[PDB]
């Protein structure tokens, strides 16, 4: 309600009043699965290209590279910058294990 958007602040000049509508819904701030999936396929093809060309460059992919593809790819592009990541590549069958964690 507009009545609860009014606030007042007092200084030496006196009391000054100000105003500022719908609250945001959770369903507008999370990308739908379809767009997520197509973006994942795009981003990971792009990463394949960048990784092969950087292997030609003989360097490692940096933060400034892929920065336009940061929060994208269902296996999130951020996961190529984790520290344990090399040990994560030895964690096999984690999803079955997670679906069996409710059981213990």
């Amino acid at each position: 309600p507009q009545s609860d958007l009014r606030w007042s602040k007092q200084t030496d000049v006196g009391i000054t009043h100000f105003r500022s509508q719908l609250i945001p819904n959770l369903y507008r701030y999370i990308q739908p699965w379809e767009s997520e999936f197509i973006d994942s396929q795009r981003v990971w093809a792009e990463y394949a290209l960048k990784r092969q060309e950087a292997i030609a460059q003989n360097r490692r992919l940096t933060l400034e590279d892929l920065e336009d593809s940061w929060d994208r790819g269902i296996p999130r592009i951020n996961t190529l910058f984790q520290k344990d990541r090399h040990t994560l590549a030895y964690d096999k069958g984690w999803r079955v294990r997670t679906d069996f964690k409710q059981y213990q």
Binding site: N25, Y27, R28, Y29, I30, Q31, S35, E67, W70
Partner: peptide, 27 residues
């Protein structure tokens, strides 16, 4: 103007599931 939530069915014609969905920048 009651404070109870209203069923979103029928009040979402002007929005998409991703409108206002933003991705954070590298830290």
């Amino acid at each position: 103007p009651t404070g109870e939530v209203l069923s979103l069915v029928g009040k979402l014609e002007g929005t998409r599931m991703g409108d206002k969905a933003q991705r954070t920048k590298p830290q």
